[PDB]
Amino acid sequence: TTALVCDNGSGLVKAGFAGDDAPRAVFPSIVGRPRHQGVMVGMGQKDSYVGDEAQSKRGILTLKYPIEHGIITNWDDMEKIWHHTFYNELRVAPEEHPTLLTEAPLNPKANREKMTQIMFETFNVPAMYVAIQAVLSLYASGRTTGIVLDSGDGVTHNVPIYEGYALPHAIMRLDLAGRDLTDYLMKILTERGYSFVTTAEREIVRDIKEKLCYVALDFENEMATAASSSSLEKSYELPDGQVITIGNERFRCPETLFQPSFIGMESAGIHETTYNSIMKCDIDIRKDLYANNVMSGGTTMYPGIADRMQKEITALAPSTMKIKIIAPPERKYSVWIGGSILASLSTFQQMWITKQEYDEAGPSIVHRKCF
Amino acid sequence: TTALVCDNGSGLVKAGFAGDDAPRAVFPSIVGRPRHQGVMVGMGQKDSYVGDEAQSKRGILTLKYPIEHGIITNWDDMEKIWHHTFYNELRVAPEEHPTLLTEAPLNPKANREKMTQIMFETFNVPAMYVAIQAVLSLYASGRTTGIVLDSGDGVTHNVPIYEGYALPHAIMRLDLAGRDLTDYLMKILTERGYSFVTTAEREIVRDIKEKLCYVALDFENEMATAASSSSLEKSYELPDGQVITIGNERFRCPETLFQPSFIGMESAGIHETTYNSIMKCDIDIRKDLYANNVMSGGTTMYPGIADRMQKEITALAPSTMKIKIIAPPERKYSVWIGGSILASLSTFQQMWITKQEYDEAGPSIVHRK
Amino acid sequence: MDSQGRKVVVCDNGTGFVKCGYAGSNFPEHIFPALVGRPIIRSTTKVGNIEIKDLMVGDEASELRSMLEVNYPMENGIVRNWDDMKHLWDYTFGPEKLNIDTRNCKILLTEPPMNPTKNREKIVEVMFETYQFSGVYVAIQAVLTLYAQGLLTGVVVDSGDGVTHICPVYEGFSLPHLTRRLDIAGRDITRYLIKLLLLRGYAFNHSADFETVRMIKEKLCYVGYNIEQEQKLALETTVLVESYTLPDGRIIKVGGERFEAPEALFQPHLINVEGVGVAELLFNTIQAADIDTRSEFYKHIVLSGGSTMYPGLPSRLERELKQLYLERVLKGDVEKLSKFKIRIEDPPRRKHMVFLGGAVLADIMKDKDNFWMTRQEYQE
Ligand SMILES: Nc1ncnc2c1ncn2[C@@H]1O[C@H](COP(=O)(O)OP(=O)(O)O)[C@@H](O)[C@H]1O
Ligand SMILES: Nc1ncnc2c1ncn2[C@@H]1O[C@H](COP(=O)(O)OP(=O)(O)O)[C@@H](O)[C@H]1O
Ligand SMILES: Nc1ncnc2c1ncn2[C@@H]1O[C@H](COP(=O)(O)OP(=O)(O)O)[C@@H](O)[C@H]1O
Ligand SMILES: [Mg+2]
Ligand SMILES: [Mg+2]
Ligand SMILES: [Mg+2]
């Protein structure tokens, strides 16, 4: 048999088989329950809906995310999504396939201990592993040195890696990601009078965000430009043919990646957080990290985020040296690709956790193997 | 008339008149600025807050320390803390009191110069002097020989002194200190899923550090007992009434002093750097340094640190001779107390840099006294 | 008034009620409903010698409503018809009430928080381009109730007619990223009360009926303190069934509807608003604030506006905040809850604490410079 790769993203679950180039399942990590008690019979068929049917039916459904800020929050619903992945999306009996899962850095330790227990005691997998998402991005980039900015649905984190060694004290984490940018977009549109609020309707703001938002390369110049011309305004058609309009809200939304004070965070922005992590590595390493910024994860898809990042870091770093932002188009799937690579290598096959190890070590084994 | 002794710690400013035995004001070396727009008439709305005032209004302030690693990184804020100290804490006009300041060894000389410019040009002090913190500590302990281990909020340093002669070549400095232990405690608490990322919340993690942490006497036995019987866990109550519990974090945190690879810097721990400072001294002096190993500064207040220190040095040094870790109860103030003594001595009264001498020779006179 | 003899009026233009008087007053002059109406003939109602003008406003429109089509010029804090709002303002400053020579007055308005942008722009416009006021200001609902309470710290729970807002303020610093809007307010409880009285077999459908059911609400409705015991009381015994007399003299019986209707504030799904109720939505606001500010916010919950006046709302709101705190912060340490300090400031004057707050603020700042927007600074 061949291993599965299952990136338990905060936003989209991405799953498939090790060795393939792109995931054979992608679906939203949501669980939906009906708003209204009034089932009929036969129809009204389930207590809860998972993944794509919960997007499709969403007008009747309260949607909850089992993952918040990269930590599993509702294990019963998270188990439901894993069950859905293997038995409905992949149609695989997991008892005979090794499954590589993923995690964000600096999570609670109890998170991955509970995670590995379910794999061995509910899905009774032969083997599994729990790789750090940023490390996987370098596999998809085909390189062994660089600083990975991964910013997903729920967490932004930086792991610097040099010559194949991580530098665990320079890792930095910032709980801004695609969720908070959507809630901020959902806020700022009240200035127009476009209320939304409903958790179903947040999925529409999410789609508005993906299709119209961009990062200004000079925020204050674009703000003063939006005061002058309609040129930035783009309309959007809601599902009922109400056409909303959005202007400077297009770029104020992702700007709070760089000015977290917009949503009351005290943190520095993503550019300065990256720079601070380089200035936490040794002098000889820094020369290489500046050349090898690797962006990863969904929110790095905003138009212009590469240029804005490159502009900002070159203003903080010493001017005598090249800074380059590596940003392939497939950087949304980097983490799944990097998992599929890792699980294919012959040198990896020795380091699976296996049932025979879990049976003697208990759940704590994950703190011993997966480093 | 009385001298004015002012220890500008990286964490706590400690100031008071000479000729008495404890600081008259101790307050944190913090300035804060409003993070939000004020929207009501008749609030204070000061552009900054200092010390205990900023610490109380902490919920709506960004907090900055003007000193980092014993270097004054923002002079505009540092003069603000001195201004608060003289006029509001000591309630004294500095124009009438000669002032004794303190500084760490192996520190950029521009710091001492600029500090002295401020005193003579802004506060008009009639005379002033700058003393090495580790040498002051021996005065408080009442002796003329020993190796002094200061560890403050921002810096750790070793200074051996024998019969009142310093050995400048044996001075060793290590920027691991109470700040790095705080940031490291913040990091490891996330393993239990707490979060303390703001600058305000770091003050709560500092308060945890001061209240719960202790140094392991044998680190692997504490790890093994924590992971099995788990009787080591202690609770703590947050400002909002949430109760956290922490376990082996209580001793993994200060163990960084002995294993700084936890933070990732390759240096020796405080024990082995102390041993190296002795082993750099001449053979005859080594005997008396082992007998007078004097701890100082607040980071040495951890329970068990004096015990662990003796255990570690005795594993390194020849077994034929005694090692005694001197650790008074007052070791938080041994730096300030030393200044109160030195400024009171009748023999010291010629050593002040007088305003007339500064006017003739500028800030560079600090290098000559 | 001002030193220059200029009258300093203070004016809340709520979606329910205009509340408009002079600065420094302890009471509002001239409470009246924000209403406009126009004469119509009904074949089912008596016509008489009472003169009905071709348009009527405010109090008169609400009492003659039995022969009027009636409109609320403002909804959810947003102006729907600027023409009817002009008429309502023309009545407010008119000979009926505050008979002011507007061109010489200073006027303090208020605007709801996080309201639409062009709403405020057109409000400020008309004050300088039709009434020609000598000075304007647009105060914030949250800070005004804090002036009426004399406080500098608290979380306001302003529950007006159109919408309910939670707004933290700490030591006079605003916390605008913590503002929370709840869509349920007193207009929807009245729409909900109609829908329940329809289930007892009554009918209320005309524009004039909407005001009548509002008065039924204000007289009879109350927030249940412990919803299980209120349902038990209604099922076990008849005592809740209380009569009311419509203007047509038809007697209606009102029963458990008295507490079912206000309950939408705490179980929003009952009126198809998705979300969590005012108690939980408030709690989720405190738990978002910086950790040490939380213990002050719990000691200064400030209620404001008429939809808080339901008998028992502070008592109920205390209970849920305590249950939320025991559940989510103390993790069930029910003995430790006894140390929790919580205060709900429930002044009986709170129905007008926004206007009372403006009268304090305008009296403190009647003659200062940087406060009032002058018509000299306008039109640039
Ligand atoms: N084209 C796009 N432009 C900007 N943001 C996007 C785009 N597509 C997706 N996103 C954001 O990506 C986030 C998902 O990140 P992703 O890495 O796919 O999930 P996870 O981080 O859970 O693995 C979503 O919240 C969405 O808002
Ligand atoms: N009882 C204690 N246990 C552990 N650490 C402490 C204790 N008291 C103070 N500290 C820490 O020591 C530092 C303050 O000590 P201090 O000697 O005043 O530093 P400095 O003099 O350099 O400002 C802070 O980091 C504080 O958290
Ligand atoms: N005694 C009362 N008990 C409960 N609700 C009331 C009472 N009196 C008035 N109300 C409600 O409160 C509102 C009165 O207007 P107000 O509180 O001034 O709101 P606004 O200031 O937003 O216009 C109306 O929605 C009315 O239904
Ligand atoms: Mg991701
Ligand atoms: Mg010190
Ligand atoms: Mg109101």
**CA C176–ligand 1 middle distance (angstroms):** 27
In the block, which residue shows the tokens 């409880």? C189
Name the residue among A177, A179, A185 with its Cα closest to residue A250: A185
> CB A267 to CB B197 under 8 A?
yes
Query: Which amino acid appears at position B201 of this protein?
Result: E
Which residues pair with residue A33 across a beta bridge? A62
Q: Which residues contact B24 (CB under 8 A, 6 or more apart)?
A: B15, B16, B17, B89, B90
Nearest ligand to residue A330 Cα: 1
- B38 vs C: CB within 8 A: yes
- The structure tokens listed for B108 are 């950029």
- The protein residue whose alpha carbon is closest to atom 13 in ligand 2 is B153
HEC profile of B179-231: HHHHHHHHHHHHHHCCCCCCHHHHHHHHHHHHHHCCCCCCHHHHHHHHCCCCC
Could you give the CA distance from residue B107 to residue B255 in angstroms, rounded to a whole number?
26
Give the C-alpha distances (Å, rounded to integers) separating A304 from A177, A309, A311, B232: 17, 8, 10, 52
Beta strands in A249-332 (DSSP E): 293-296, 325-326
Q: Which residue of B has its CA nearest to A174?
A: B197
**CA C12–ligand 3 middle distance (angstroms):** 13
Could you give the CA distance from residue A86 to residue A79 in angstroms, rounded to a whole number?
11
Pairing of strands A4-8, A99-103: parallel
- The structure tokens listed for A190 are 């009240």
DSSP per-residue codes, C10-46: EEEE-SSEEEEEETT-SS-S-EEE--EEEE---TTS-
- The structure tokens listed for C31 are 């409470």
Quick check: A168 and A161 in contact, CB under 8 A?
no
Torsion of CA C370, C372, C376, C379, to 10 degrees: 110
Q: Which residues contact C151 (CB under 8 A, 6 or more apart)?
A: C300, C302, C345
Pairing of strands A49-50, A25-28: unpaired
Quick check: A147 and A293 in contact, CB under 8 A?
yes
CATH superfamily of B1-27+69-134+334-367: ATPase, nucleotide binding domain (3.30.420.40)
Considering the four listed CATH numbers 3.90.480.20, 3.30.390.50, 3.40.50.150, 3.90.640.10, the one that applies to the domain covering A182-270 is 3.90.640.10
**CA A103–ligand 4 middle distance (angstroms):** 9
> CB A106 to CB B190 under 8 A?
yes
Quick check: B355 and B127 in contact, CB under 8 A?
yes
Query: Which of B58, B63, B190 should we substitute to test contact with A (largest number of A Cβ atoms within 10 Å)?
Result: B190
Query: Which amino acid appears at position A267 of this protein?
Result: S
In the block, which residue shows the tokens 């990286």? B10
User: How many residues are there in chain A?
Assistant: 371
Pairing of strands A31-34, A61-64: antiparallel
Residues of C in contact with B35 (CB under 8 A): 173
Quick check: C129 and C32 in contact, CB under 8 A?
no
Domain topology for A135-181+271-333? Nucleotidyltransferase; domain 5 (3.30.420)
Name the residue among B126, B107, B153, B113 with its Cα closest to residue B4: B126
**CA A10–ligand 4 middle distance (angstroms):** 6
Q: Which residues contact B166 (CB under 8 A, 6 or more apart)?
A: B132, B135, B159, B160
- A362 vs B: CB within 8 A: no
> CB C274 to CB A35 under 8 A?
yes
Q: Is A333 exposed, middle or buried (0-12, 13-18, 19+ CB in 10 A)?
A: buried
Could you give the CA distance from residue B342 to residue B353 in angstroms, rounded to a whole number?
15
Quick check: B234 and B246 in contact, CB under 8 A?
yes
Name the residue among B268, B271, B284 with its Cα closest to residue B321: B284
Give the C-alpha distances (Å, rounded to integers) separating A85 from A65, A79, A92, A269, B211: 16, 10, 9, 35, 48
Name the residue among C145, C177, C179 with its Cα closest to residue C300: C145
Nearest ligand to residue C31 Cα: 3
User: How many residues are there in chain C?
Assistant: 380
Could you give the CA distance from residue B48 to residue B38 in angstroms, rounded to a whole number?
13
Name the residue among A369, A323, A303 with its Cα closest to residue A128: A369
Neighbours of chain A (3+ CB pairs under 8 A): B, C
Name the residue among B178, B184, B186 with its Cα closest to residue B154: B178
Question: Is residue B10 lining ligand 2, measured as CB closer than 6 Å?
Answer: yes
In the block, which residue shows the tokens 């009027």? C68
Q: HSE on the CB side for B125, CA within 13 Å?
A: 29
Q: HSE on the CB side for C258, CA within 13 Å?
A: 23
Domain with CATH 3.30.420.40 in chain C: 4-140+350-380, 141-184+274-349
Quick check: B157 and B171 in contact, CB under 8 A?
yes
Q: Measured in whole angstroms, how far is the alpha carbon of residue A339 from the centre of its chain?
A: 14
Could you give the CA distance from residue B101 to residue B7 in angstroms, rounded to a whole number?
6
Could you give the CA distance from residue B204 to residue B332 in angstroms, rounded to a whole number?
20
Query: Which amino acid appears at position A304 of this protein?
Result: G
Could you give the CA distance from residue B127 to residue B96 in angstroms, rounded to a whole number?
9
User: From the CA atom positions of chain A, what is the Rg in Å?
Assistant: 22
Query: Which amino acid appears at position B172 of this protein?
Result: M
In the block, which residue shows the tokens 């990256």? A274
Name the residue among C217, C186, C204, C218 with its Cα closest to residue C72: C186
- B238 vs C: CB within 8 A: yes
Could you give the CA distance from residue A282 to residue C236 in angstroms, rounded to a whole number?
77
- The structure tokens listed for A282 are 């040794």
**Ligand 3 site residues, Cβ closer than 6 angstroms:** C 14-17, 160-162, 186-187, 190, 214, 217-218, 305-307, 309-310
Could you give the CA distance from residue C356 to residue C26 in angstroms, rounded to a whole number?
7
Name the residue among A341, A325, A323, A324 with its Cα closest to residue A333: A341
Which residues pair with residue A293 across a beta bridge? A147, A325
Name the residue among C177, C172, C139, C140 with its Cα closest to residue C153: C172
DSSP per-residue codes, C293-351: THHHHTT-EEEESGGG-STTHHHHHHHHHHHHHHHHTSTT-TTGGGG----EE--GGGG
CA distance A169 to chain B (A): 6
Q: Which residues contact A289 (CB under 8 A, 6 or more apart)?
A: A145, A146, A147, A160, A162, A278, A281
Could you give the CA distance from residue B138 to residue B145 in angstroms, rounded to a whole number?
7
Helix (H) / strand (E) containing B27: strand B25-28
Which residues pair with residue B25 across a beta bridge? B15
Could you give the CA distance from residue A165 to residue C328 in angstroms, rounded to a whole number?
41
**DSSP-derived 3-state class of residue A129:** strand
Neighbours of chain C (3+ CB pairs under 8 A): A, B
- The protein residue whose alpha carbon is closest to atom 23 in ligand 1 is A9
Quick check: C88 and C36 in contact, CB under 8 A?
yes
Could you give the CA distance from residue A313 to residue A292 in angstroms, rounded to a whole number?
13
Buried b (16+ CB within 10 A) or exposed e, A291-306: ebbbbbbbbbbbeebb
Quick check: B8 and B101 in contact, CB under 8 A?
yes
Residue C1, annotated ligand binder? Answer: no
How many Cβ atoms sit within 10 Å of the Cβ of residue C232?
11
Quick check: B247 and B226 in contact, CB under 8 A?
yes
Instruction: Find the DSSP H helices in A105-158.
Output: 109-121, 133-140
Could you give the CA distance from residue A81 to residue A226 in angstroms, rounded to a whole number?
43
Q: Is A125 exposed, middle or buried (0-12, 13-18, 19+ CB in 10 A)?
A: buried
Could you give the CA distance from residue B46 to residue B60 in angstroms, rounded to a whole number?
13
Could you give the CA distance from residue B90 to residue B87 in angstroms, rounded to a whole number?
6
Give me the phi and psi of A35, to 5 degrees please.
Answer: -65, -40
Query: Which amino acid appears at position C63 of this protein?
Result: E
- For chain A, count helices (H), then strands (E): 14, 19
Quick check: C354 and C145 in contact, CB under 8 A?
yes
Query: Which amino acid appears at position A42 of this protein?
Result: G
* Pick from A187, A191, A199: CB nearest C274: A199
Query: Which amino acid appears at position A358 of this protein?
Result: Y
> CB A191 to CB C177 under 8 A?
no
> CB A264 to CB C177 under 8 A?
yes
- Tell which atom from ligand 1 comes closest to the C-alpha of A152: 21
Buried b (16+ CB within 10 A) or exposed e, B165-186: eebeebbbbbbbbbbbbbebbb
- A267 vs C: CB within 8 A: no
How many Cβ atoms sit within 10 Å of the Cβ of residue B12?
21
Quick check: B330 and B139 in contact, CB under 8 A?
no
Residue C62, annotated ligand binder? Answer: no
**CA B296–ligand 2 middle distance (angstroms):** 10
Could you give the CA distance from residue A291 to residue A284 in angstroms, rounded to a whole number?
13
Question: Is residue B302 lining ligand 2, measured as CB closer than 6 Å?
Answer: yes
Domain topology for C141-184+274-349? Nucleotidyltransferase; domain 5 (3.30.420)
Q: Chain B neighbours among A 71-130 (CB < 8 Å)?
A: 71, 106-111
Q: Which residues contact C53 (CB under 8 A, 6 or more apart)?
A: C39
**CA C358–ligand 6 middle distance (angstroms):** 13
Give the C-alpha distances (Å, rounded to integers) separating A272 from A288, A303, A317, B32, B150: 18, 20, 10, 21, 34
Quick check: B182 and B209 in contact, CB under 8 A?
yes
Q: Under CATH, which architecture does the C185-273 domain have? A: Alpha-Beta Complex (3.90)
Q: HSE on the CB side for A9, CA within 13 Å?
A: 32
Could you give the CA distance from residue C191 to residue C205 in angstroms, rounded to a whole number?
10
Quick check: A326 and A146 in contact, CB under 8 A?
yes
Work out how many CB contacts closer than 8 A connect A with C. Answer: 25
Helix (H) / strand (E) containing B67: strand B67-68
Question: Is residue B293 lining ligand 2, measured as CB closer than 6 Å?
Answer: no
**A1-27+69-134+334-367 and A135-181+271-333 in the same fold:** yes
Q: For A97, which DSSP code?
A: S
Q: Is C93 exposed, middle or buried (0-12, 13-18, 19+ CB in 10 A)?
A: buried
Question: Is residue A180 lining ligand 1, measured as CB closer than 6 Å?
Answer: no
> CB A266 to CB B190 under 8 A?
no
Give me the phi and psi of A321, to 5 degrees please.
Answer: -150, 155
* Pick from A109, A169, A267: CB nearest B263: A169
Residue C222, annotated ligand binder? Answer: no
Could you give the CA distance from residue B184 to residue B263 in angstroms, rounded to a whole number?
7
Q: Is B321 exposed, middle or buried (0-12, 13-18, 19+ CB in 10 A)?
A: exposed
Query: Which amino acid appears at position A248 of this protein?
Result: N
Rounded to the nearest 5 degrees, what angle is found at the Cα of A353, between the Cα atoms of A347 and A358? 160
**DSSP-derived 3-state class of residue A192:** coil
Quick check: A223 and A248 in contact, CB under 8 A?
yes
Which residues pair with residue B71 across a beta bridge? B68
Residue C217, annotated ligand binder? Answer: yes
What's the first-to-final CA gap in chain B, in angstroms? 21
Could you give the CA distance from residue A155 to residue A206 in angstroms, rounded to a whole number?
16
Q: Is A231 exposed, middle or buried (0-12, 13-18, 19+ CB in 10 A)?
A: exposed
> CB B60 to CB C171 under 8 A?
yes
DSSP per-residue codes, C198-244: TTTT----SHHHHHHHHHHHHHH----SSHHHHHHHHHH-STT-EEE
- The protein residue whose alpha carbon is closest to atom 19 in ligand 1 is A11
Give me the phi and psi of A23, to 5 degrees please.
Answer: -65, 135
Could you give the CA distance from residue C64 to residue C50 in angstroms, rounded to a whole number?
9
Q: For B59, which DSSP code?
A: G
How many Cβ atoms sit within 10 Å of the Cβ of residue A201?
17
**DSSP-derived 3-state class of residue A29:** coil
What's the first-to-final CA gap in chain A, in angstroms? 25
Nearest ligand to residue B134 Cα: 5
Name the residue among B212, C231, B194, B132 with its Cα closest to residue A106: B194
Could you give the CA distance from residue C90 to residue C31 in angstroms, rounded to a whole number?
15
HEC profile of C126-183: HHHHCCCCCEEEEEEHHHHHHHHHCCCCEEEEEECCCCEEEEEEECCEECHHHCEEEC
Residue C301, annotated ligand binder? Answer: no
**DSSP-derived 3-state class of residue A58:** helix
**DSSP-derived 3-state class of residue A311:** helix
Give me the phi and psi of B16, to 5 degrees please.
Answer: 180, 165
> CB A35 to CB C175 under 8 A?
no
**DSSP-derived 3-state class of residue A361:** helix
- A267 vs B: CB within 8 A: yes
In the block, which residue shows the tokens 């710690």? B9
- The structure tokens listed for C2 are 């001002």
Biggest alpha carbon distance in chain B? 73
Rounded to the nearest 5 degrees, what angle is found at the Cα of B88, between the Cα atoms of B85 and B90? 65
Query: Which amino acid appears at position B55 of this protein?
Result: Q
Instruction: Please report, for chain A, the start and end positions of each structural domain, with discontinuous segments joined by +.
Output: 1-27+69-134+334-367, 28-68, 135-181+271-333, 182-270
Residues of C in contact with A262 (CB under 8 A): 177
Could you give the CA distance from residue C145 to residue C354 in angstroms, rounded to a whole number?
5
Q: For C108, which DSSP code?
A: E
> CB B62 to CB A168 under 8 A?
no
Give me the phi and psi of A165, to 5 degrees please.
Answer: -125, 130
Could you give the CA distance from residue A38 to residue C269 in angstroms, rounded to a whole number?
14
- The structure tokens listed for B210 are 């001061």
Q: Is B63 exposed, middle or buried (0-12, 13-18, 19+ CB in 10 A)?
A: buried
What's the first-to-final CA gap in chain C, in angstroms? 28
- For chain B, count helices (H), then strands (E): 13, 19
Domain topology for B28-68? Actin; Chain A, domain 2 (2.30.36)
| C4-140+350-380: CATH number | 3.30.420.40
Give me the phi and psi of A308, to 5 degrees please.
Answer: -65, -45
Structure resolution, Å: 3.4
Buried b (16+ CB within 10 A) or exposed e, B113-129: bebbebbbeebebebbb
Could you give the CA distance from residue C202 to residue A12 in angstroms, rounded to a whole number?
51
Could you give the CA distance from residue B40 to residue C142 in angstroms, rounded to a whole number?
10
Could you give the CA distance from residue B120 to residue B150 in angstroms, rounded to a whole number?
29
Query: Which amino acid appears at position C213 of this protein?
Result: V
* Pick from A106, A108, A169: CB nearest B264: A169
Residue C162, annotated ligand binder? Answer: yes
